[PDB]
Amino acid sequence: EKYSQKEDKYEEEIKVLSDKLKEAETRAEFAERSVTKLEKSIDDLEDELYAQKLKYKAI
Amino acid sequence: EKYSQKEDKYEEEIKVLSDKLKEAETRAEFAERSVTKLEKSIDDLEDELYAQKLKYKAI
Amino acid sequence: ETTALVCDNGSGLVKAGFAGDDAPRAVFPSIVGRPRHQGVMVGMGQKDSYVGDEAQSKRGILTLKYPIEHGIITNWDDMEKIWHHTFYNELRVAPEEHPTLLTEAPLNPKANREKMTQIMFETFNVPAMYVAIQAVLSLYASGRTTGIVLDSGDGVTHNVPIYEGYALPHAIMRLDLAGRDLTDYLMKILTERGYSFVTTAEREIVRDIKEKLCYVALDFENEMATAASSSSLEKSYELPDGQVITIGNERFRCPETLFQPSFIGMESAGIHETTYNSIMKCDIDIRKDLYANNVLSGGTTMYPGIADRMQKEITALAPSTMKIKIIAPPERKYSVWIGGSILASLSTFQQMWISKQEYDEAGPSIVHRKCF
Amino acid sequence: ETTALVCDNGSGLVKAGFAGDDAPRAVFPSIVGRPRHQGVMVGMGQKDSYVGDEAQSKRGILTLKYPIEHGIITNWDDMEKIWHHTFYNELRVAPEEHPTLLTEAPLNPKANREKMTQIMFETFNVPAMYVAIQAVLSLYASGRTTGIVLDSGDGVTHNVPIYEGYALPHAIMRLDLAGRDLTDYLMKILTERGYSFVTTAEREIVRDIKEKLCYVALDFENEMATAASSSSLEKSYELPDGQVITIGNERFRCPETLFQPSFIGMESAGIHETTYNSIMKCDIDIRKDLYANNVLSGGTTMYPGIADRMQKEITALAPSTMKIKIIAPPERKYSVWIGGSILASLSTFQQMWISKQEYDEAGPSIVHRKCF
Amino acid sequence: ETTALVCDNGSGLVKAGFAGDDAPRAVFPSIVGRPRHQGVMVGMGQKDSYVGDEAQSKRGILTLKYPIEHGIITNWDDMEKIWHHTFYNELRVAPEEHPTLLTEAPLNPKANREKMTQIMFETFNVPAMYVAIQAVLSLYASGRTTGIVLDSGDGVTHNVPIYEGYALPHAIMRLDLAGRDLTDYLMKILTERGYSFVTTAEREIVRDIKEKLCYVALDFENEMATAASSSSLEKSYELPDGQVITIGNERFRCPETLFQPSFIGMESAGIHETTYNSIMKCDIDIRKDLYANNVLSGGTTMYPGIADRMQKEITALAPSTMKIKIIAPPERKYSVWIGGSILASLSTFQQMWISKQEYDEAGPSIVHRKCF
Structure with missing residues (x-):
């Protein structure tokens, strides 16, 4: 009786943990893409700041 | 016994998912913190970029 | 395919039968008897020795002795009479047609493995044979390939961790x-209550009592207190010749010696302790399967309520991030024999048997090349 | 463009996949396993060797050995089993259809360059291959053809100054x-704290610990003082079999050996010092670009807080008339591999492939005329 | 020079005495024990604990508990009873008059270094103490400041390469x-022969057996073959209650585990291998002196015929361009202690003493600034 009831709970738990893992991964993966997009913008700004330094040294 | 073998499996799966989830959580936790960090570095670089732009304009 | 005899060499009951069955077909006492008289029985057919239910029923003209004590064959000549009774009386078949699988304790003496190999092959003329550790078979009967067996027989207790069918040596x-010990202990502690038993004809009733009425307490001090505070921890037993005796705290005290060996003058550590001290010798990546797959096996583990006690005890010694769980098979008393039936009926195992030709080449020693 | 494999052959994890991707598609342990005893399993299939996550999970039967130790291929026979696992198990593709970009350590032995050429062509029958230097690739991943790559592996740190996409020998x-060293060192210094470890199953948890909990201090004396004055420089780790251990100052001490090689009894100079020295052996004109483009690569550089430490150290050795800036990729651990992908997916690289024809004519030695 | 005690705290025999002697004064079992029950002896004085030869004289009343296991103090409360026995019973002197040189295992836990500092100062009120590494002392006993000491205890083997009198961490x-392990192993393999020993009162005879009858084979396969082909590799031992037992191949098998750790499930490498490896982690220049000065120490090295085996093994791993020679002291089992005496009797060591004053100021932790 207990094994049936513990099975029921555990199926529910597995399901809740699995959906949670999948959600955590997609969002985590979206945040990594968010960083990659920010980084790209640091790189643009860094380059532009360097070009601005070459010009500034010149003039 | 079929329930005991499955039950066992369902616990082992719950552990493995709890463990896998927690690694996805720690990473997510880290992504939010990185974003906050980059936003601060971006602010700093934009500010330097403007300050360089003033200097270039000026001379 | 050749039908194997699987013979479990128990220190109190012999369990024997044919392979391809999931249950023993013969169960009889590990007892051997010889005449009180200077010859055979009066006016009846000649027998020099007697076994099992014949020795139990003819007892008034016999002296009785035990062939196996504490998981060790203590007389070859009587282990032979168990074997003679097994093939020709109980299963009524020629052994010379049927390969033999024999059960043994972990670390069973090598001189013994050999005298067993030799006796089977020369006298019985077996076509092929194998010898296998009790716990290794009980793991196969538990449906699992990696784990640990607490095997407690009618005479010895072992803790045996196993990986993919090999015990970790x-x-x-x-x-x-x-x-075995448990009966002699029970008998002592009953004399102490004032139910003195001094005769071996009483010892076998004390054995039966033990099997029926002993129970493993979940908490030793709390049950002990309960029996001291109230007589509700006592069950009556009516002896065969009338006379109602009352068995008290002896019920849980008797098996208590398994957890505390110092009660009977031993220096050894308890069965739960030797479970813990066994698993901690193994690799961390396999400790997960060992602690999760703690299997109870053998006749001594059939006392009710044992799992909750063992669950307790092991979780107290072991860290609370190894998963802890007691596996108790539905008929754990037979799980060695059932695992022997499974092993003897695998298709890949048919290459493992000792053949009569390999015995003719290397003598009884072939068991130390074919077996482990 | 015919799909190339990029196999970044790391000293602790192999990173492998298909070109045209900006990320590895298999990331698994650089481990190979072989049986400890005669006979491996009972009632199941068995085989002579195991690799990666199969060797990590089926562990109880295995001795474990490695293809690569200190960036140096130390056993051809295990590098082969990693390769066999890579094509047929992990990516489940025929290598004979797919050109292969192999990565090599900066200044890898020539006899090794050749045994790798030969083994890929004769056994795997690759159509084509090229060997490119791991650092050189890590720079292409950062989008430059000028800078210094400090590639600090799971076993070797190299400083390679690159100008115009040319490594300066x-x-x-x-x-x-x-x-690799870092794990063995960490394990030592934990024994010293009284958390003794000896089994290689423990060493791989010590490895995991190292990757999770180590951090590069910005100031070694000030953090050391902090840990001596307060227990706030300690993080708990619960081992996989329960038992909570506390990891102290070992967190920053372990990687501290990279700045001060004398702690392990070397005559070597520190990573920072070697970077400075690298730039000073280089042409006067380019040194500005190298300091300004100190590009971090590999698994050892993924400890937090590395950049502020490296920024410090390099500005202290280097003139303040040269611009100094640390460039740390978003996923610097994969920089080698990523760079292989970008390079191997280039149309210009297609003419750079060592063909089988070129193999058949000159033997394994052809590698040295096409790859520098 | 104020008379120092040298207390070589072995895992099976404690060795104690006064400095200025070239030999230990008292050598006694590393055992402590406590009564099995409240009320166990009549007509004589009961005690809460017993130690060494006093415990061994009347062992039956005691549960033994061990002060040291595998070169680690595993119970403080019993190491204290060894110390109490040492000063007041065996040397019959006030410790508070006598500086104390304590020996420590190579890489002993720091929390242990401290609890030892503290226990000596607070309870015994020592004037002064120093803790010196046991291997480091064994080399001073051989008259060098350069070589390797393989100190193989009654419980732990350590290889410590020493250069200029400095241990290389x-x-x-x-x-x-x-x-320690060797006794438990010997006992297992005797049960396997069918001489089952299950009681720790037997294990101490098995210990004695081991010390008397074990010998290091020069060639493991050839001696093994000899014992399989003839019974000339067997020596009789008469047990202390009669009964002649025969000890076979177990004689050389027992110590064989030192060369092949896989025989008892360990993932570690052999003593020879660890010596070779030790020298290879050391500076290139000194490796000639270390091979040439492979100095043997401790109780486990007193098995006959060790040197020829060790000479062999080390020349096979090591280049023949490096000089190889085993140095075995005349009484190598005392080397630790003897070295303590020489050191503790030095005028230069007198400035090295941790004074009570230095204790009062910094607590037990002072050990780590004065002792390395």
Whole structure:
């Protein structure tokens, strides 16, 4: 009786943990893409700041 | 016994998912913190970029 | 395919039968008898020795002795009479047609493995044979390939960790204390209550009592207190010749010696302790399967309520991030024999048997090349 | 463009996949396993060797050995089993259809360059292959053809100054100390705290610990003082079999050996020092670009807080008339591999492939005319 | 020079005495024990604990509990009873008059270094103490300040390469397998022969057996073959209650585990291998002196015929361009202690003493600033 009831709970738990893992991964993966997009913008700004330094040294 | 073998499996799966989830959580936790960090570095670089732009304009 | 005899060499009951069955077909006492008289029985057919239910029923003209004590064959000549009774009386078949699988303790003496190999092959003329550790078969009967068996027979207790069908030879633990000892102990502690039993005809009723009425307490001090505070921890037993005796706290005290060996003058550590001290010899990546797959096996583990006690005890010694769980098979008393039936009926195992030709080449020693 | 494999052959994890991807598609342990005993399993299939996550999970039967130790291929026979696992198990593709970009350590032995050429062509029957230097690739991943790559592996740290996409051979510094050594060192210093470890199953948890909990201090004396004055420089780790251990100052001490090689009894100079020295052996004109483009690569550089430490150290050795800035990729651990992908997916690289024809004519030695 | 005690705290025999002697004064079992029950002896004085030869004289009333296991103090409360026995019973002197040189295992836990500092100062009120590494002392006993000491205890084997009298921390190999383990192993393999020993009162005879009858074979396969082909590799031993037992191949098998740790499920490498490895982690220049000065120490090295085996093994791993020679002291089992005496009797060591004043100021932790 207990094994049936513990099975029921555990199926529910597995399901809740699995959906949670999948959600955590997609969002985590979206945040990594968010960083990659920010980084790209640091790189643009860094380059532009360097070009601005070459010009500034010149003039 | 079929329930005991499955039950066992369902616990082992719950552990493995709890463990896998927690690694996805720690990473997510880290992504939010990185974003906050980059936003601060971006602010700093934009500010330097403007300050360089003033200097270039000026001379 | 050749029908194997699987013969479990129990220190109190012999369990024997044919392979391809999931249950023993013969169960009889590990007892051998010889005449009180200077010859055979009066006016009846000649027998020099007697076994099992014949020795139990003809007892008034016999002296009785035991062939096996504490998981060790203590007389070859009587282990032979168990074997003679097994093939020709109980299963009524020629052994010379049927390969033999024999059960043994972990670390069973090599001189013994050989005298067993030799006796089977020369006298019985077996076509092929094998010898296998009790716990290794009980793991197969538990439906699992990796785990640890607490095997407690009618005479010895072992803790045996196993990986994919091989027992780990550095990690095994042994305790001589189980069902044989348990009867002699029970008998002592009943004399102490004032139910003196001094005769071996009483010892076998004390054995039956033990099997029926003993129970493993979940908490030793709390049950002990309960019996001291109230007589509700006592069950009556009516002896065969009338006379109602009352069995008290002896019920849980008797098996208590398994957890505390110092009660009977031993220096050894308890069965739960030797479970813990066994698993901690193994690799961390396999400890997960060992602690999760703690299997109870053998006749001594059939006392009710044992799992909750063992669950307790092991979780107290072991860290609370190894998963802890007691596996108790539905008919754990037979799980060695059932695992022997499974092993003897695998298709890949048919290459493992000792053949009569390999015995003719290397003598009884072939068991140390074919077996482990 | 015919799909190339990029196999970044790391000293602790192999990173492998298909070109045209900006990320590895298999990331698994650089481990190979072989049986400890005669006979492996009962009632199941068995085989002579195991690799990666199969060797990590089926562990109880296995001795474990490695293809690569300190960035140096140390056993051809295990590098082969990693390769066999890579094509047929992990990516489940025929290598004979797919050109292969192999990565090599800066200044890898020529006899090794050749045995790798030969083994890929004769056994795997690759159509084509090229060997490219791991650092050189890590720079292409950062979008430059000028800068210094400090590639600090799971086993070797190299400083390679690159100008115009050309590695400068006179200024290549190889330093054997990084992630392999770092585990063995961590384990030592934990025994010293009284958390003794001895089994290689423990060493791989110590490895995991190192990757999770180590951090590069910005100031070594000030953090050391902090840990001596307060227990706030300690993080708990619960081992996989329960038992909570506390990891102290070992967190920053472990990687501290990279800055001060004397702690492990070396005559070597530190990573920072070797970077400075690398730039000083280089042409006067380019040194500004190298300091300004100190590009971090590999698994050992993924400890937090590395950049502020490296920024410090390099500005202290280098003139303040040269611009100094640390460039740390978003996923610097994969920089080698990523760079292989970008390079191997280039149309210009297609003419750079060592064909089988070119193999058939000159033997394994052809590698040295096409790859520098 | 104020008379110092040298207390070589072995895992099976404690060795104690006064400095200025070239030999230990008292050598006694590393055992402590406590009564099995409240009320166990009549007509004589009961005690809460018993130690060494006093415990061994009347062992039956005691549960033994061990002060040291595998070169680690595993119970403080019993190490204290060894110390109490040492000063007041065996040397019959006030410790508070006598500086104390304590020996420590190579890489002993720091929390242990401290609890030892503290216990000596607060309870015994020592004037002064120093803790010196046991291997480091064994080399001073051989009259050098350069070589390797393989100190193989009654419980732990360590390889410590020493140059200029300085232990090299990066190249210290600790291997838990030696004399403690060796008894438990010997006992297992005797049960396997069918001489089952299950009681710790038997294990101490098995210990004695081991010390008397074990010998290191020069060639393991050839001696093994000899014992399989003839019974000339067997020596009789008459047990202390009669009964002649025969000890076979177990004689050389028991110590064989030191060369092949896989025989008892360990993942570690052999003593020879660890010596070779120790020298290879050391500076290139000194490796000639270390091979040439492979100095043997401790109780486990007193098995006959060790040198020819060790000479062999080390020349096979090591280049023939490096000089190889085993140095075996005349009484190598005392080397630790003897070295303590020489050191503790030095005028230069008198300035090295941790005074009570230095204790009062910094607590037990002072040990780590004065002792390395």
